[PDB]
Design a protein around this motif. Structure first.
Motif, PDB file in Angstrom:
ATOM      1  N   UNK A   1     -94.197  68.923 -38.905  1.00 25.26           N
ATOM      2  CA  UNK A   1     -94.655  67.802 -38.120  1.00 25.26           C
ATOM      3  C   UNK A   1     -96.146  68.023 -37.752  1.00 25.26           C
TER       4      UNK A   1
ATOM      5  N   UNK B   1     -99.616  65.630 -38.931  1.00 25.13           N
ATOM      6  CA  UNK B   1    -100.470  64.966 -37.933  1.00 25.13           C
ATOM      7  C   UNK B   1    -101.947  65.249 -38.085  1.00 25.13           C
TER       8      UNK B   1
ATOM      9  N   UNK C   1     -88.431  76.684 -29.873  1.00 27.78           N
ATOM     10  CA  UNK C   1     -89.207  76.012 -28.859  1.00 27.78           C
ATOM     11  C   UNK C   1     -90.603  76.582 -28.719  1.00 27.78           C
ATOM     12  N   UNK C   2     -90.898  77.686 -29.415  1.00 26.31           N
ATOM     13  CA  UNK C   2     -92.208  78.166 -29.569  1.00 26.31           C
ATOM     14  C   UNK C   2     -93.082  77.108 -30.199  1.00 26.31           C
ATOM     15  N   UNK C   3     -94.234  76.944 -29.584  1.00 23.28           N
ATOM     16  CA  UNK C   3     -95.289  76.107 -30.198  1.00 23.28           C
ATOM     17  C   UNK C   3     -95.552  76.478 -31.641  1.00 23.28           C
TER      18      UNK C   3
ATOM     19  N   UNK D   1     -92.517  58.822 -23.847  1.00 25.37           N
ATOM     20  CA  UNK D   1     -92.356  58.657 -25.323  1.00 25.37           C
ATOM     21  C   UNK D   1     -91.041  57.958 -25.681  1.00 25.37           C
ATOM     22  N   UNK D   2     -91.177  56.975 -26.576  1.00 21.00           N
ATOM     23  CA  UNK D   2     -90.124  56.025 -27.017  1.00 21.00           C
ATOM     24  C   UNK D   2     -89.292  55.395 -25.875  1.00 21.00           C
TER      25      UNK D   2
ATOM     26  N   UNK E   1     -85.285  63.689 -24.655  1.00 20.35           N
ATOM     27  CA  UNK E   1     -86.548  63.452 -25.310  1.00 20.35           C
ATOM     28  C   UNK E   1     -87.638  64.319 -24.627  1.00 20.35           C
TER      29      UNK E   1
ATOM     30  N   UNK F   1     -90.000  67.572 -26.359  1.00 24.09           N
ATOM     31  CA  UNK F   1     -91.468  67.506 -26.431  1.00 24.09           C
ATOM     32  C   UNK F   1     -92.178  68.714 -25.866  1.00 24.09           C
ATOM     33  N   UNK F   2     -91.503  69.448 -25.016  1.00 24.00           N
ATOM     34  CA  UNK F   2     -92.136  70.659 -24.361  1.00 24.00           C
ATOM     35  C   UNK F   2     -92.070  71.850 -25.303  1.00 24.00           C
ATOM     36  N   UNK F   3     -93.215  72.430 -25.647  1.00 24.97           N
ATOM     37  CA  UNK F   3     -93.253  73.679 -26.380  1.00 24.97           C
ATOM     38  C   UNK F   3     -93.698  74.808 -25.490  1.00 24.97           C
TER      39      UNK F   3
ATOM     40  N   UNK G   1     -97.168  73.499 -23.984  1.00 28.04           N
ATOM     41  CA  UNK G   1     -97.950  72.504 -24.710  1.00 28.04           C
ATOM     42  C   UNK G   1     -97.009  71.354 -25.073  1.00 28.04           C
TER      43      UNK G   1
ATOM     44  N   UNK H   1     -95.321  66.511 -30.565  1.00 24.76           N
ATOM     45  CA  UNK H   1     -94.742  65.221 -31.046  1.00 24.76           C
ATOM     46  C   UNK H   1     -93.313  65.396 -31.569  1.00 24.76           C
ATOM     47  N   UNK H   2     -92.454  64.479 -31.114  1.00 23.48           N
ATOM     48  CA  UNK H   2     -90.983  64.461 -31.323  1.00 23.48           C
ATOM     49  C   UNK H   2     -90.271  65.812 -31.079  1.00 23.48           C
TER      50      UNK H   2
END
Ligand code: 9Q6
Ligand code: 9Q6
Ligand code: 9Q6
Ligand code: 9Q6
Lengths: 329, 329, 329, 329
Positions: free
Chosen positions: A34, A38, A231-233, C328-329, D34, D38-40, D325, D328-329
Motif C-alpha cells: 500500500x 501511494x 502493526x509496525x509502520x 476515514x470512509x 477502521x 489506521x494507527x501504525x 504514525x 492508509x487503510x
C-alpha cells in the motif's frame, strides 16, 4: 513478476505460506505494498542520458544495481540447490547476496561461490557463539555483517500455527553442529570485526541516529516484511525521515514489498542507498533454480534502468534527488 | 462517452490494448483518472452569462474550445482514413489537431486539410533528420512544434509484450522514406523555427520554469497517458504548482484522462490554458470515422459550454479563476 | 429510511430515475453522501437534558425541527394528491414546506393548506412574470422567497436523456397559463417584496458574503442534489467556511443527502441553521401519500431528538456549538 | 479471535445481534475498527527485554494486563453461568472485571468471586436508588465506580427493533427487586464514596478536563461500542488529545474494537492507561463458558507480551512512550 504464479503451482501450500506470510492479521505485510503504491515520482526531463548507470558503491564494493538479496532462511525449502543457486546468480548479476544465520548450506560454502557476500547475524543465547559466527563470516570473505535487530524473538505467524508448519527433515541449519540483541550486542559485534555492521529492522528515527552514533555502517529500514510486529509502520513510510536524520552518516537501505524497478526508483527517490529483495528471489528460485534467479535479476536490472532513464536520472545519485508526491490509492 | 464501448466491439483486441495501455502496472494510467475525480469545482452563481464563449487564443490563433487533439501515432490502425478524418473533423470543430511524427499519412497531406495543425516532434538519432522534419512542418503551415520530451525511449508496455503486438503491414510511418532529447535539442529546435515550441511531458516544477527560460511558448503537463514512467505523478496533480511557477510565461496545457467537459472545466480551474484529448478521439474515429470524431467534438463542446455556465463562467479566463477543493474518492 | 425501497417497487423506473438522478457521472450526487459520512460528531456529556427541544426560529416563525421540505417539482408525478399531501403533513409536523415554481398544483392552493409555506422562484425569461409570481406568493401568505440561483439552465441529466423521460399529460405546471438569474435579478426580487429572500444553490464563500451584502435573509448551501454542475463541491464541504464568512448575517441552510436525524445533527454541528430534505419526502409520498410523509417526519423528529440528546444538546443552538472531526470512509 | 465464529454458530441470531449491534447505520461501530487499523506503531529496537512485564497499577491495585473486562449487561444471555464465569476467569487472569448495573446475577455474588471487581453505575430516575447501588458496590469490596455517562437514555438499535428482541423470561436484572446523569449526579456519586469514580463515555476534550476538575479518578474514552450516538467519533480518534489535556490528572482508558494485543499496544502508544474489552469476552463466554474466557485472556496476555517485546517495551509505561504514525487503510 509472473514468477509468483509459477511458484504457487509448484510449492507445497504450507511452504508457500511460510514464504508469503506475515505476523498476526498481516496488517504490516499489506501496508508495505500500500505504502509503495501511494508514492509517485516526479520525473525530470531532457537531461543527458548518454551513460545511464545503475551502479553504486556500497561498503567498499561496487554493486551492479542498488539492490541486494535479502536474507531468507532455509533456501533448500524452495529448491534443492537452495542458497548456492541464489548466490551464484547474485554473483553473476553483480548484486550482493546476504547469507542467513539459518542458511540450509553452510556460510563458508555460500561465500566460496564468490561475488559480494554479506552475512546476516541473529544474536544467540551465547554471546561467544554469535561472535564466532561473525568471525567465520569474516574469515570467509563476507563484506558486511547485517545484524538483524528486530528479532528479540520471532513474531507470531498465524499461517504457520494453523498450518502446523515445521522444517522437513531434509532441510537443516547448516551453520550449526535465539536471544534478544541490545545496543550492547551491537557494540560487541562492532568491537569483534573490522567489517561494516548494518542494522536491520530499524524503524524509529531515533534508533537510526543512535545506530550511526553506535558506529553502524548501515541500516535497513524495515518491518521485516510484516513478519515481526503486526502493526509496525512500513519501512517506506519512515525512510525519508530516517534519511534526513542520519545525514549521510551511514548507508540507508530499505526493504519490504519491492516488486519492480519502479519500486526501486521510488525507494531511491525517498532517499534509500539500496533495497533488499526477499520473497521475489525465492519465487524465482522455486520456479526455476539458479537460471530463474538470474532472470529475475536481469528483469529487475532492465526495469531499474528503464525507470531511471524515464525519470531523467543518469545515476542512482540523481535518482536520490528526485522528488516525490504522495497520492490516493 | 459511450464511444469506448462502441470501439471495443470493433477493434482487434491487440489494437485496442495498444490504444488503452499504460506502462508497467498502469499505476499512472489509473492515477490520471483518480486524480481528476478527486478535484471538485467551486461554482460561482448569479453572473451574467449573456455571451458564454468557450473560445481561447493560443499560439496566435483562435480555437473554438480550450482543447486540442493529442498526438497519437498510426491513426490508420483505428480507421482507414486515419489522420485525415481526425484532422477534418478537428478543423470543422475549430480545434487544433496535432500531427504525429509517426503519422500513418504524411504531415503535408494532414496539413493540407487546413484548420490549425500542430506538429509533434520526436527527436531522432540524427539531429538533421529532426530539424528537417521541423522545417517540413513549418513549410506546411503547422502553427506549433509540440516537442515530446518524455520519450528518451518508449516505456515498457506490458500489454504489447504479452500480446506480441506489431504494426500490421498496411500501416506505416508516412513521414519517413529514436534518440533522447536534451535541453540542447530544445535549443536547436528553437533556433531552427519561428514557430512556438511546446514541450510535452513536463511534470517537475523546475522543468516548467526552465522550459520558459529556454524560450518555450508552451508546455504540456503530462505523464504521457501513463505510458512512459509507471509511477510518474499525474499531470493534473502537478498543474496547479506548475501554473503558479511559470507565472504566465508560457501556455500551460494538461492532458491525461480528460473524459468530459466537466473534466476540461476542472483542468481550466486548476489553471490550464487548454487540454489535450487522446484516446477518446481514437475511440470515436474507430467507432465511426470522421463523422464520429465530429460528434465527439460536438458533445465535448456542449459539455464544456454547459459546465462553464453552471459554474458561472462566461469565458475560459473566468473558468481559470474558479477555486477548487480536493475531496474523497 | 426503508421508504426508498418501498418507492422503488411502485414508481415507474423512469419516474424513479427522474427523482433519484444527478447530472453527468453523478459525481456530486454521491459526493453529498460521502461527505456526510466522513463527518464525525464530538458529543458532549452530562448536561441537563430536562427540556430537549428541536425547535428553531427562522424567518420570523417557529419551526418544530431545524428542517424544511425542499422544493421538488411536479409532486403529482409521485402520488395523485402531490403537493397537497406533502404540504398538509409538513404543516401538521410544524416543518416549512417549499412550494415550487413548477408545482403540479397551484401555489395559492398549496398555501391555503396553511402551515409555513415558502415559495421557490425560478427566474423566467420575462422579469415581470417572475415578479408577478413573487407577488402571488406573498399575497398567498408565503413566508420566504427561496430564489434558486444555481439554475441559469438545467444541468444535463444522463438518466433522463437515455430514458427519453417526459412529463406525462396528467401532470402540469399549475402556476402557469427559463432564464439566468443575476445579482440584478436578486435585487429586483428584493425590491419587490418585504419577505426574506433566500438564495439557494450557493457554494462559494464569496457568493455567500455577497448574498448577505445583497440583503438576502438566507442562503442554502447546496449543489442542487448533484443535479446541476457535475463535479460541484458538496454543500456540506463548504458549510463550515460559509458559516464563518457570513458571521450571523443571514441564516445558512444546507441540503444534499440528509437521510437521518444524525445527518441533521452533523449539519447543525457544521453550523447550519436548518436542512432541507428533498428525495426522502418524495419516497414517503410515493410510498403512502400524506400519511407516509407524516411518518417520515415523525421518524426524523424522533431521530433528531435522539441524536441531540445523545450529543448533550438541549437545543439546536447547542448542537451548532458541537465540534466535529473528519474521519476515514 | 476465532471465537466470534464459534459464538455465531451457537447463539440465537437475535442474541448475537443484541451483542454485535450498533446504533443507526452502525457508522460508529465500524469506525472503531477502521480507526484502529489506521494507527501504525513505530517500534523501538535493541532495548533490554530481560524482564518484560505487562502489569500496571491502577486505582490502587496491580492488574496483570493493561485491560479490564468491559461492562456488558445480562451475561446469562450468553451462557448459563453468565457473570460468575467471566468474573472467575478475570480474577484468575489478574484482570479487573466490571460488574454491570443490569447484571443477570447480583453484584454481591459477583464480587464474592473476589479478584478486582469494578462496578458500573447507571443513573436511575431516583437519586437514592443510585446512591444505594453505589453503597452496595462499595460494601461488597468493589474497587471503582464506573459511572456510565453516555446513556442519558439508550441509543436507537435498529437490529433490535427489526428483530423485536426482548429479554427472555429466564434472564433478569438481579440487582433490582433510566435517567440522565449530569455533572451534579457525578458530584453526588463522588460525595457518597471514597472509591475512585471513573467516567465512561467521554469523547470531548473539554469533558475530559472537566472530569478531572470534578474529581474523577479516571475516564473511559469511548463511544460505547458504536451503540449510543451513531456518528460519534471513535474513542481512539480522541484519545491522544484527551491524554495530553488531562496531563496525568486521571487514568485514561479507551475502548471500542480492541481485538488483539497489537490493538492494546496501539491504544497504549496513543497514551491509554488501559483498555476495556467487551464483545470478545462475551464471544468466549458463549463459546465455552469460564474456560473459554480464561483462554481469551491467556491469548490476549501472550499477544500483549509479544507485541510489547517486538516494540522494544519492557513495561506498559514504555509502550505509552512509543510513537505512532497514521497510515492508509
Ligand atoms: C520466508 C522468509 C524468511 C525470512 C525473511 C523473509 C521471508 C520471506 N526475512 C525478512 C527479509 O530479510 C526482508 O526483510 C523481507 O522479506 C523483505 O520484504 P519482501 O520479501 O517483501 O521483499 C528475514 N530477515 C532476517 O533478517 N532474517 C531471516 O531469517 C528472515 O527472518 N527470514
Ligand atoms: C495509442 C497511443 C499512442 C500515443 C499516445 C497515446 C496513445 C493512447 N501519446 C500520448 C498522448 O499524446 C497523450 O499524452 C495522452 O494520450 C493523453 O491521455 P488520454 O489518452 O487519457 O486523453 C503520444 N504522445 C506523444 O507525444 N507522441 C505519440 O506518438 C504518442 O506517444 N503515442
Ligand atoms: C426530482 C427533483 C427535482 C428537483 C430537485 C430535486 C429532485 C430530487 N431540486 C433540488 C432540491 O431542492 C434539493 O436541493 C435536493 O433534492 C436536496 O438533496 P436531497 O434530495 O439529497 O435531500 C430542486 N431544487 C430547486 O431549487 N427547484 C426544483 O424544481 C428542483 O430542481 N427540482
Ligand atoms: C451487548 C452489549 C451491552 C452493553 C455494552 C456492550 C455490548 C456489546 N456496553 C458497552 C461496553 O461497555 C464497551 O464500551 C464496548 O462494548 C467496548 O467495545 P467493544 O465491545 O468493541 O470491545 C455497555 N456499556 C456500559 O457502560 N453499560 C452496559 O450495560 C453496556 O451498555 N451494555
Amino acid at each position: 513478476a509472473d514468477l509468483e504464479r509459477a511458484a504457487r503451482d509448484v510449492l507445497p501450500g504450507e511452504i508457500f505460506d511460510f514464504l508469503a506470510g506475515g505476523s498476526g492479521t498481516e496488517a504490516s505485510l499489506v501496508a508495505n505494498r500500500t505504502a509503495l503504491e501511494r508514492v509517485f515520482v516526479i520525473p525530470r526531463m531532457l537531461r543527458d542520458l548518454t551513460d545511464v548507470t545503475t551502479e553504486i558503491d556500497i561498503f567498499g564494493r561496487r554493486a551492479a544495481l542498488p539492490m541486494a538479496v535479502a536474507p531468507v532462511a532455509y533456501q533448500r525449502l524452495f529448491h534443492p540447490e537452495g542458497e548456492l543457486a541464489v548466490a551464484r546468480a547474485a554473483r553473476d548479476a553483480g548484486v550482493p547476496y546476504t547469507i542467513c544465520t539459518l542458511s540450509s548450506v553452510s556460510l563458508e560454502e555460500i561465500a566460496a561461490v564468490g561475488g559480494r557476500p554479506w552475512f546476516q547475524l541473529f544474536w544467540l543465547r551465547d554471546e561467544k557463539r554469535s561472535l564466532d559466527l561473525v568471525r567465520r563470516a569474516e574469515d570467509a570473505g563476507c563484506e558486511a555483517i547485517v545484524f538483524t535487530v528486530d528479532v528479540p524473538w520471532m513474531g507470531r505467524r498465524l499461517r504457520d500455527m494453523r498450518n502446523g508448519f515445521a522444517l522437513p527433515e531434509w532441510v537443516t541449519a547448516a551453520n550449526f553442529d535465539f536471544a534478544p540483541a541490545t545496543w550492547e550486542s551491537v557494540e560487541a559485534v562492532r568491537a569483534h570485526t573490522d567489517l561494516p555492521v548494518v542494522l536491520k529492522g530499524i524503524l524509529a528515527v531515533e534508533d537510526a541516529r543512535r545506530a550511526v552514533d553506535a558506529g553502524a555502517g548501515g541500516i535497513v529500514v524495515s518491518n521485516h516484511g510484516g513478519r515481526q510486529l503486526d502493526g509496525a509502520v512500513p519501512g517506506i513510510e519512515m525512510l525519508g525521515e530516517i534519511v534526513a536524520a542520519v545525514s549521510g552518516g551511514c548507508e540507508v537501505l530499505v526493504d519490504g514489498g519491492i516488486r519492480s524497478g519502479g519500486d526501486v526508483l521510488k525507494a531511491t527517490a525517498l532517499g534509500a542507498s539500496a533495497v533488499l529483495v526477499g520473497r521475489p528471489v525465492m519465487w524465482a528460485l522455486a520456479a526455476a533454480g539458479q537460471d530463474g534467479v538470474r532472470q529475475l535479476l536481469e528483469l529487475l536490472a532492465e526495469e531499474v534502468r528503464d525507470a531511471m532513464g524515464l525519470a531523467g536520472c543518469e545515476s542512482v545519485g540523481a535518482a536520490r534527488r528526485l522528488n516525490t508526491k504522495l497520492g490516493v490509492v
